[PDB]
Design a protein around this nucleic acid. Structure first.
Length: 290
DNA sequence: GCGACACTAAAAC
DNA sequence: AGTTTTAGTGTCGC
C-alpha cells in the first residue's frame, strides 16, 4: 500500500496511490522526492571576460512534493500542490570568485547581467506548453500567480529535509536559521571588495536567492489530462537556466527588466522530467469512491 | 468538469 | 497546552 525509498539525506519517500489510500493533508507522507531530471541540452556558451575560460554550468533540480512513483509511472494530481526546487553550480568557479568576475555570452559577446532559472510545463508528446499556476499559503484567500524567473547565484541544492522544514516558516527566529541557505544579501557585503563591473552588482535586487523554490504549484485548472483515446496525456516539467542580457539567432525569451526595458533571458541549459501522468478531478481518482 | 466554499487533520507556533 | 495555519479533498451549483 505504501512503498518506501530512502532519499539521499536519510529521509524517506513514501509512494502511495490516492485512489486507494487517503492520507492527511499535512502528513509528512505527502513530502517525497519526485522523478529525476535529465539533460535536454546545452545552449549558449558563457566565458569569463578576461581569461576567456568557459564557465561549466549544471542545473541541480528536484521535486519534493506532488508526485508518486506508482507502477513505473510518475503520477501527480491536478488539485494538489507540487514543489520544484533548483540551484545551479559552476564546477570550475568558486562562488566568491564568480561574484567578483564578469561573464560574456559567446554568440559577438553580450555581457551577462545575471543568471536566472525559470520553469515550464509541457506536453511531452508534442512540446506544447502548459500553463502553471502558484498560490500563496493563503490559497483562495490570497493571489494566484504564474511561476516567475528567479535570479540566482550558484549554490548546492538543499537536502529534501531542509526544503520540508522551510516550507511553512513564518517565525522570525526560524527564518533567521534558514536565511543563509536561501539568500545572499548583497547589501551586507563589503562594497570596496568589488568592481563596478562585477557580476554581483548587476543582479537586479539586493536580496538574491541561492535556491529557486517553486512551492504550491499546480498545472492550470484548464488542463485536459487525457487524450481523446482516453489514454493519459504525458506531461513534463522543465527547468531552464538562462543569462539575462541587455537587448540593445539563439534561443531566448523576452523578460520584463528592472529599468523597464525589454530584457533577454538567453538559454544556457535545460533539464526535464520523464513523462508524468496527471490525475484529474474525477471521483474515481480518489479513495472516497471505494 | 469547473470555481467556490466547506471540512478537517497535522504542522506551526 | 491551546489556537491558528495550511493543504488534501468532499461537496455544491452552474
Amino acid at each position: 500500500v505504501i512503498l518506501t525509498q530512502l532519499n539521499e539525506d536519510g529521509t524517506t519517500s513514501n509512494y502511495f496511490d490516492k485512489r486507494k489510500l487517503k492520507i492527511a493533508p499535512r502528513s509528512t507522507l505527502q513530502f517525497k522526492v519526485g522523478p529525476p531530471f535529465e539533460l535536454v541540452r546545452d545552449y549558449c556558451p558563457v566565458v569569463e571576460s578576461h581569461t576567456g575560460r568557459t564557465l561549466d554550468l549544471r542545473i541541480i533540480p528536484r521535486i519534493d512534493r506532488g508526485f508518486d512513483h506508482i507502477d513505473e509511472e510518475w503520477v501527480g494530481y491536478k488539485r494538489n500542490y507540487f514543489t520544484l526546487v533548483s540551484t545551479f553550480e559552476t564546477a570550475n568557479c568558486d562562488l566568491d570568485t564568480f561574484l567578483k568576475s564578469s561573464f560574456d555570452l559567446l554568440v559577438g559577446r553580450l555581457r551577462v547581467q545575471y543568471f536566472a532559472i525559470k520553469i515550464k510545463a509541457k506536453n511531452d508528446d508534442d512540446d506544447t506548453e502548459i500553463n502553471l499556476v502558484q498560490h500563496t499559503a493563503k490559497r483562495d484567500k490570497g493571489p494566484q500567480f504564474c511561476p516567475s524567473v528567479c535570479p540566482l547565484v550558484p549554490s548546492p541544492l538543499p537536502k529534501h529535509q531542509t526544503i520540508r522544514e522551510a516550507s511553512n516558516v513564518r517565525n522570525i527566529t526560524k527564518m533567521k536559521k534558514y536565511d543563509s541557505t536561501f539568500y545572499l544579501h548583497r547589501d551586507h557585503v563589503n562594497y570596496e571588495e568589488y568592481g563596478v563591473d562585477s557580476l554581483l552588482f548587476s543582479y537586479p535586487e539586493d536580496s538574491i536567492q541561492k535556491v529557486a523554490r517553486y512551492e504550491r504549484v499546480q498545472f492550470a485548472s484548464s488542463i485536459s489530462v487525457k487524450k481523446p483515446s482516453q489514454q493519459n496525456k504525458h506531461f513534463s516539467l522543465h527547468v531552464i537556466l538562462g543569462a539575462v542580457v541587455d537587448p540593445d539567432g539563439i534561443p531566448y525569451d523576452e523578460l520584463a527588466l528592472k529599468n523597464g526595458s525589454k530584457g533577454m533571458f538567453v538559454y544556457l541549459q535545460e533539464m526535464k522530467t520523464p513523462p508524468l501522468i496527471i490525475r484529474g478531478r474525477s471521483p474515481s481518482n480518489y479513495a472516497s469512491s471505494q
